[PDB]
Design a binder for this molecule. Structure first.
Ligand code: P0T
Ligand code: P0T
Ligand code: P0T
Ligand code: P0T
Lengths: 330, 143, 330, 143, 330, 330, 143, 143
């Protein structure tokens, strides 16, 4: 029964590899498992709780390595869906994926350590958490948004840094004598960074009233300039979400794809040479239209569309105008 | 070769009705209409832009020779057709069902006739398993 | 006089149940009442103020249970407006509503306790505060906005968590020896969480200068990554508000609704069978147009509308063209 | 039953002018124009999309039998008509005044005549109280 | 020379009353003056600086009362530009404006006190600062934006308050015994408010590790929910700014105003009665078009405009169609 | 070989002066260099690290002055690309640029000091960091965005300041007696500023329960009003980024520029005088169209474009209508 | 009064060509065209919407009597004309220059003739000072 | 001078066909069509707006004298042409290649003929180095 086995295997591949819907819940469970490890490992660092922490962590490590091994095997078995990952060579290539090799490495490391490696344990927990991304999607999205607002982020950083050094230096001048907090300029810089960030430990704070006046005037600005990057990036992320949401509606990649496939086949499928020419030119046209359907993929295209029709309108009426001109002579 | 170059020049002259060595929009449009297919102004301009590698809006025989001198190996169309098919593939695993292909492909884009769908099936459904894989099809497309 | 009684009852139903305008003020008053309870209950936890706090809270509890009972009765009386809540069975079903049963339960609990239950008192205050939502609207809106930005929130969380663990570990290494604050890694994690969140209690802070350098470099990034979720959600909420504000203007649900009602009635109302066919097909068309007026309900439809007319324009000129073609032969 | 199936086939043939067992847009449009109502291209395409449960753009007798086999009970049209009426009901409590109904309903959507409004009142204003409730009307609609 | 005096007086009125451009600088200067008073008054509260602070504040109060009196007189003299404020009665009505009466009251109060009233001085400084708004524009703008996002702000508040009470109660349970910070539930509530707000004084913080675990898990959410209102309001303000910026470009209030004035005059200016009818109906039309140019004043009107033209084009071709139909018979 | 030398020189000019792509990396390196100096200088202020800090800083200063001198020379040699900076006079004018003179001044100052000037060293490090902007772009962008939201920022500031003074005064009243933190009103103002900003040092905090109640109620609002400016500016920056991103696509400055150049040349290039008139009027038209392509440069122009065509369509059909009218008589 | 009511009825009949007591868009459009001014469909619909205080799209004599019974005092047009003029007044103080009025008012909206501008000046520029104030003009407008 | 003023008046009369001392859109359009080049309504309105420095939509001889009295020195067109060329200059350094100039300039805007491009090259490519600098060209343009 290859049909049912293939169906079950494709379901397992969907739930394990990039999922879409309820499959996330399963991953969430796995996350919790590994998450628990983290917490337990932290508790294993406390002398008071070392005994019980490690006692529970041994069982939990057995559980997690068993789960990860079973998941790895089920994954390399459900990889048969992908054409690239078919047969011995295909599945070996699948296991060649960086996250798969990392998974097997962490598995054999956990097996070895179970049968001092606390630092290794923490690092492997970190790695099995990182694998969840599996694509760099978080890093790629953050980098895209940061690059989009690079100038605004840099101006915020530059102005905030100038404010930090200026305010810290002025408060240092106002407090170098009558406050043991600001012994040196490094202490004042630490204070300024810890306040403009609004962390405000309280280890250092101005006490002389001129110092407090300067600190007030400069914090009122520095706190805003230090909070600016968070607001800028948040607004950028939200605007990008809205843009993607409105872009995913028209879905104008279907007809260009069909035209491209037809043109590619036909181009593969004196006068004969001219026909083959026309066909390869049309193939280049298919490539061009597909590409122009890839990159812009935005609402501005709609405006462009209108413009086209706009010109079309003009052209059309010209013909109509020409027609009525003939009616003048008839 | 000599025969290939002579045939390419014959085809270009077929395109180049005027005989001045410069193909324009009008000649290509008229000849391709004579072939049967009616183009559009935007379509002709797109062909001109894609084929004009000189910078004057018209083409000469050397450009046509460099074009047809291209080989299926270097078209670099692999990733493009791959992404197109992934857009086609609802599942996303990399396999297309025969019924879905029959319903969709023949009813969109450059429509195709029954002989066309038959030949796609012949040269794609090698195993006759319905769920036609396209990676092999595109690899042999390049070759 | 059923007319005036019905009018007064519908006004009371509007003010009690989902209100629109000035009725909110009344609810605000009620909120304040229950709010007062909360504060008083908190004051009742202080040994110093226990006497006076409880003395005032007894009278205030009498007042609030009286108000809630009167409101509950006025509500089950003004529920007669809704057709579902008419007569004995209708009103019994109305009382079956989860918030109504909760209301009567809290009422009888307050009556019983009035005639140790401090924990019960606090929980019932919480419940009568929660009832104000009465639909989950707050939860539904928050969930919708969070789901919309799920990827951005998750990337912010993942990067912030990596920054937290990395910075805390590095500062722990820099401070494990020369600072009793960072005894273990758990202490360093607590510090990192309390600083990157910008809470900054001051119980733990780096003191070694390499530790302070690492803390500065990593806080400058971690604070932004920890503030990112707030900015993302705020921007999402504001953008959603703007979208809803611009969507609520066209109000294109009137004509489709009228067409749907007409078609439904007509479909309810050899050749006769073909006519009934045509009618049921038109009923399906009415269902489809109503649904397509429900889901999209967005500005993009306008573009679609233009596109329709766009194609329409083509078609019409074609006919015009055809006409002039005849004029060529005449 | 046999009589119902025969009448349904007669109606389908009335629709299927060609007699090939495949109803297209042209035949439905022409027959329903002969009935009196003029459609639109989008209207016919929407009917085709709603009635085409096969995947070829045309319909056969089994599809029409399955359609007409549908009954008022299982259409699941309750919630839809409810939300429509709430949109109609300005107050939102669930009652519609007679004057508002007369002004709005007959002057929007598929316009109705005086006999139509009279029959709506007859089968809706059972109590003759003006403020016609629709929940009972739609419950008997389903039945 | 009434011409030059009128010109100078209108310039003074522009600079004093609602200004547009560089006049703000003057007001800024005045602001600084009153601002200085504030600071000096604060310094006058310190016993150490009381002597010098009051010594400088006496001269500064003389200066500020002189400036305010001169400004008040120049204002009631430059008020002659406004038609309403012309002549004895007009200028008396001008002085009747609430901010003008407040100004004269603060002036005479400062004169009297100069010739214990420290609280009076502080309040009057506050009042002369408040007068700068003179319109409630700040309050009106804030209220508009808050009302626009009322539901989002309320859901953020409700969820944040639930998080606050829940986290406070749980940490209180975890710390009621082994931490003198959380003596009662009021102490825990104070802690929760001071941390979820990210103020984090450090007076109270969890110490038991279960308490710290709960505090971490609940702060990671509560801080975001408490920062949500700031982000929501900031995004709302920015979006409103963008909307106003794009709305102020078309300026479609000119032609409707001209039509309204023409129609109003004409309506003021058997068959005669029918003509006057036509005119009053056209006056109602002018009122309607002016109102419809007032309220919407948005980009959506453009869509509506298109729709109008859309239908228009339909209608137009119909006539054209009719025309060609005649050509069929000719 | 002037061709290759010119190519290399233009590449060097691109990498040094305003760069576009990978050249930023080089500048980043330079930034790091100067950045290092900052840190080292700070370390040079610590008595403990003074020896090693200054020892490393001497070599690092040699390195940085060598790098800056080499960069300055390579810059004044690669300036030959710009036409203005050609030959002796052109290059002297180039060196006249404020950042160039500042660069040479800092270079000679570093050379002199190397062969007490610690304050000079810090100031020169600051200046060579500031030079990176080289245009005021950060300041100009910040000023533009602040001016755009001036009213919203000012209302946030005004409401936050009222909240600050009110809350501080009320807490001072509640705590003037039973808390040594709030000795005077200045102490209460410092507390209010340090809490509403969410810095929360912990040096001052309310302790009396009425004081804590007032502090809670007023902080719940003041923290939001103090965080408002950051959110407003962040949203403004993000919206401006989106606007610029969508504006940079159409790039409608090409054809107007070509028309302007043609018209300018032609205008430079009885009936002859009338022709020259027509030409100068067309030159004014070219100036006008270029200017109108400069300022708006926004999506609203698209709407305007439609309107034009809108009217055009009207006009066109009128002509068509006129035509058919003739057909009535023929 | 009796004379006023009779004249109003005569005017309504002039509008009501049919004589059925219900004025529609066609009659108003035709009569107002006969007057000389050509309306638009949107303009006629706007008049209908503004004058239809019943709910059937047509008007009867009582509505016209109530309309014309309106006086300059109770139109509440003060604030509207004020804001309109402030939009006109570039300075914003509340005075309009004679040259600006002559250039703008006669070259926008419902264009006016030379006699019209002369009468505006006569009844507005009472002082002949150029800077025509409008608050007095609108106060006498109301009276 | 007297000769210049007389020639300017002759040119204005050539524009002012009517002879009433007020040039309108119709006269300018007709005369400049007789010159050969066809305008647009927006183009004529733009000329009117740019040349109408009075406020009535028409022009008189004094305005034309003030216009033509303008010299190349005071047009203040420097920065505008500079920014235009920077938009043209892809590199942004301030030099334009001869091939790019030939391809772009003659194929955009107000199209120019071969003699036109030849004269641009003559008066711009003084050094004949290809990479024509424009700052000198515009400085001599102003003079
Ligand atoms: C990746 C993020 C989130 C940005 C972009 C990259 C940089 C170097 C830091 C972030 C950031 C801050 O975290 C803080 C500031 C305020 C100035 C701090 C003074 C040194 C600016 C600033 O851009
Ligand atoms: C419901 C909100 C508001 C989001 C979404 C759900 C989650 C788990 C938390 C919120 C949130 C933080 O409150 C803080 C961060 C920063 C990283 C913290 C490191 C553990 C991310 C982060 O998504
Ligand atoms: C006028 C502003 C800025 C809003 C709206 C009005 C209200 C009552 C407070 C502000 C506000 C907070 O300042 C803080 C929260 C977080 C919850 C606090 C828990 C009591 C919500 C919250 O809406
Ligand atoms: C340049 C920025 C970022 C703005 C605009 C200019 C001003 C004076 C300060 C910033 C700012 C705050 O930094 C803080 C507040 C809150 C009120 C503080 C009470 C004195 C408002 C406020 O506009």
């Amino acid at each position: 029964r290859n049909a049912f086995y293939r169906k079950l295997q494709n379901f397992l591949y969907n739930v394990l590899e990039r999922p879409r819907g309820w499959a996330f819940i399963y991953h969430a469970y796995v996350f919790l498992l590994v998450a628990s490890c983290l917490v337990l490992s932290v508790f294993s660092t406390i002398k008071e709780y070392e005994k019980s922490s490690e006692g529970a962590l041994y069982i939990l490590e057995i559980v997690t390595i068993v789960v990860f091994g079973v998941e790895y095997f089920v994954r390399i078995w459900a990889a048969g869906c992908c054409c690239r990952y078919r047969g011995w060579r295909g599945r070996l290539k699948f296991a060649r994926k960086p996250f798969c090799v990392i998974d097997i490495m962490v598995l054999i490391a956990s097996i070895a350590v179970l049968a001092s490696a606390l630092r290794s344990l923490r690092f492997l927990q970190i790695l099995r958490m990182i694998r969840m991304d599996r694509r760099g999607g978080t890093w790629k999205l953050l980098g895209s948004v940061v690059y989009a607002h690079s100038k605004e982020l840099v101006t915020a950083w530059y102005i905030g840094f100038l404010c930090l050094i200026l305010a810290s230096f002025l408060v240092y001048l106002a407090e170098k004598g009558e406050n043991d907090h600001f012994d040196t300029y490094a202490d004042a810089l630490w204070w300024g960074l810890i306040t403009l960030t609004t962390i405000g430990y309280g280890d250092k704070y101005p006490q002389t009233w001129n110092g407090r006046l300067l600190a007030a005037t400069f914090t009122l600005i520095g706190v805003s300039f230090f909070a600016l990057p968070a607001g800028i990036l948040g607004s950028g992320f939200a605007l990008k979400v809205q843009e993607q949401h409105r872009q995913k509606h028209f879905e104008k990649r279907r007809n260009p794809a069909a035209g491209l496939i037809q043109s590619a086949w036909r181009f593969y499928a004196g006068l004969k040479v001219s026909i083959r020419a026309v066909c390869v030119m049309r193939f280049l046209v298919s490539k061009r239209k597909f590409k122009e359907s890839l990159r812009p993929y935005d609402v501005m295209d709609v405006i462009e569309q209108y413009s086209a029709g706009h010109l079309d309108m003009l052209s059309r009426i010209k013909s109509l105008q020409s027609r009525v001109d003939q009616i003048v002579g008839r | 070769t000599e025969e290939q170059i002579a045939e390419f020049k014959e085809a270009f002259s077929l395109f180049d009705k005027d005989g001045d060595g410069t193909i324009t929009t009008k000649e290509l449009g008229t000849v391709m209409r004579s072939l049967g297919q009616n183009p559009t102004e935007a379509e002709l301009q797109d062909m001109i832009n894609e084929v004009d590698a000189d910078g004057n809006g018209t083409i000469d025989f050397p450009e046509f020779l460099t074009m047809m001198a291209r080989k299926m190996k270097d078209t670099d169309s692999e990733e493009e057709i791959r992404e197109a098919f992934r857009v086609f593939d609802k599942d996303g695993n990399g396999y297309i069902s025969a019924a879905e292909l029959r319903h969709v492909m023949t009813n969109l884009g450059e429509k195709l006739t029954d002989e066309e769908v038959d030949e796609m099936i012949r040269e794609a459904d090698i195993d006759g398993d319905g769920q036609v894989n396209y990676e092999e099809f595109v690899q042999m497309m390049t070759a």
